[PDB]
Each structure stands twice: as C-alpha cells, then as structure tokens.
C-alpha cells in the first residue's frame, strides 16, 4: 500500500542474529558520513523517534585509511567503552576530515586528552580486553551485514537502509522521512 522493500529500505537477504536493534556504520573519512552526522545529525534525529530505551548503537570501520583507520577504530572503540562517544564524534570528524590535522595514533590520543579523557585513562582501556573485544564486535558486525559502503544503517539486523527511497531536494523532510523508516522497522 505505502512502505516498500527495494524502495526506502531493502530487506537483508541473509539476516544476522544477536544483532544490535539499530546500528549504523561510518568512517571518519567519508565526506558523506561526515554529512550524515556533522550536517544532518541523522543519529540524534533518529534517536528521538525510537521507542522507549531501544538500543541505538554505532560502529566505525576500516577500509578507508589503511593503517590509521584501524587505530581510529580502536581509538573509537575506547570511546564506546567509556561511553564518551558523544564528546568525541565531533572533534574527530573535524580533526580528520575538515581540519586535516590528524595523522597518527596520538594526534588522536591528544583529542581524547583534549575532550576530557585522561591520557592514561584513555590508554588504560585502549590496550584493554574490553576494547579489543569491542573492536572485533565491529570488525565482525560489518562482515555480518555483508557491508560494502558507508554510512549505513540496519534494523534489528534485518533491514538495511535505502536512503534513495526518499527526497533529495528537501533536507528538513528527507530526515524525518528517514527516521520514519527506522521507527517502522522497530516494530516489524
């Protein structure tokens, strides 16, 4: 009647268990992903339509940045542990893409320093099992939803996101029209 596979979402062919209820991917290099979050804040937006306390997770990925990508991931992974994410997303996007001032593990290190994370406390867990586990939890979460590009989104690990099912001229609209698709798939 009015909500379609291959249109605004696609249904995942081989659907993955134990999955996060909703889960996004992104690199700190894809100007698009940068848009997705920097410019349109889509997460925050989407966060808000979601039902009572339904887990909204978010993983970073490797292909873009060879050596650094990984550490960026590992680094990130930390922020997942310390529940710091919210305070580092933005320095990092910026540091990496926009400011072009990030080159090494430490430039990054320093950003956690910068954002209210203690240089030792941010290393205490960096090498911790907590993190290492988490990295893989990602490395493998991509691999599971047979992933090719970013940013990307998937609901209860069943439904990948067709953002082309939607407007491309009006932001204000596309967003809400986006968050909708997600809500819809959260009770399906």
């Amino acid at each position: 009647a009015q909500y379609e596979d291959g249109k605004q979402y696609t249904t995942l062919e081989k659907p993955v268990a134990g999955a996060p209820q909703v889960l996004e991917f992104f690199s700190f290099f894809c100007p698009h992903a940068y848009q997705f979050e920097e410019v349109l804040h889509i997460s925050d937006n989407v966060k808000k339509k979601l039902p009572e306390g339904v887990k909204m997770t978010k993983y970073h990925v490797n292909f873009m940045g060879g050596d650094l990508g990984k550490d960026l991931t590992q680094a990130w992974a930390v922020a997942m542990a310390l529940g710091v994410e919210d305070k580092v997303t933005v320095p990092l996007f910026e540091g990496v893409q926009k400011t072009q001032t990030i080159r090494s593990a430490s430039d990054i290190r320093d950003v956690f320093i910068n954002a209210g994370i203690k240089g030792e406390e941010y290393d205490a867990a960096w090498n911790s099992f907590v993190v290492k586990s988490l990295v893989a939890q990602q490395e493998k979460a991509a691999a599971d939803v047979q992933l090719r590009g970013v940013p990307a989104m998937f609901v209860n690990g069943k439904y990948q996101l067709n953002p082309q099912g939607m407007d491309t001229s009006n932001m204000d609209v596309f967003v809400q029209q986006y968050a909708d698709t997600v809500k819809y798939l959260s009770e399906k």
Partner: protein, 134 residues
C-alpha cells in the same frame, strides 16, 4: 567504425590498463563501474551492430544508448562529488552484480595488478557517437 573505436578503444582501455598496475594501484569503486561502462560497450559495440556484418547497424545505437549514457554520469556523478559531497550517498571498496553476473569482479578489478579526462571523454565519445549514426 570497428577499427577507429578498437584502435582507440584499446588505446584507452589500456591507457587505463598499461598503467593501472604501473599506477601502482590507485583506489576506486567507480573504477569498475566506469571501466565497465567501457568494456561493456566498446567490446560489444565493435562486435555490437557494426558487428561481424555491417547491413544492420542499429543494435549498436541501442548498445550506444545505455552505453556511455552511464559512462557519462558514472563519471559525471563520481566527479560531482569529489569536491561537492552529499549525505544520501556512500564510499565503498566493493564488487556487485544484481543477477549473478559474477566473474566480472574477480578479474578486471583483480587482474588490474585523472578523473579529468574520463568525465569529459565519457561524454566526448557520446555526442560524436550519436550525431554521425542517428
């Protein structure tokens, strides 16, 4: 036709190729797509409807319909992004064939071991391709 394309087709297929590997190995997902909006047409545009016989050259005009059409935008878009980004989009490093047309990305991406020209010549090799034929 055949030759004038093949002569040049080769000379640009390989201008990619010849150097693809000498180019060490620059990243690209548009890569294939566009190199396929190439070899998908030229190969089967020589062989197309100018073909093994020349008294039926309209199958190619069709093969030159959906040809550099993509060839145009495949580069067109591709380059539209390169300084001018957009949310409702991606950035990958991956194979795909929505009907099991599979081998194609276990070979030409595989046995591969500057947007400037492409974008324009994908459209340059279009109006001239249409004018003289249609």
């Amino acid at each position: 036709a055949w030759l004038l394309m093949a002569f040049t087709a080769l000379a640009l297929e390989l201008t990619a190729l010849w150097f693809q590997h000498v180019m060490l190995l620059k990243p690209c997902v548009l890569c294939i797509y566009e190199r396929v909006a190439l070899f998908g047409v030229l190969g089967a545009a020589l062989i197309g409807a100018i073909a093994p016989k020349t008294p039926l050259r309209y199958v190619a005009m069709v093969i030159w319909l959906y040809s550099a059409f993509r060839g145009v935008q495949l580069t067109y878009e591709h380059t539209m992004l390169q300084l001018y980004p957009s949310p409702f989009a991606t950035c990958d490093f991956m194979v795909r064939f929505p009907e099991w047309l599979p081998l194609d990305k276990w070979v030409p991406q595989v046995f591969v071991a500057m947007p400037q020209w492409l974008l324009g010549i994908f459209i340059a090799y279009l109006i001239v391709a249409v004018l003289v034929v249609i």
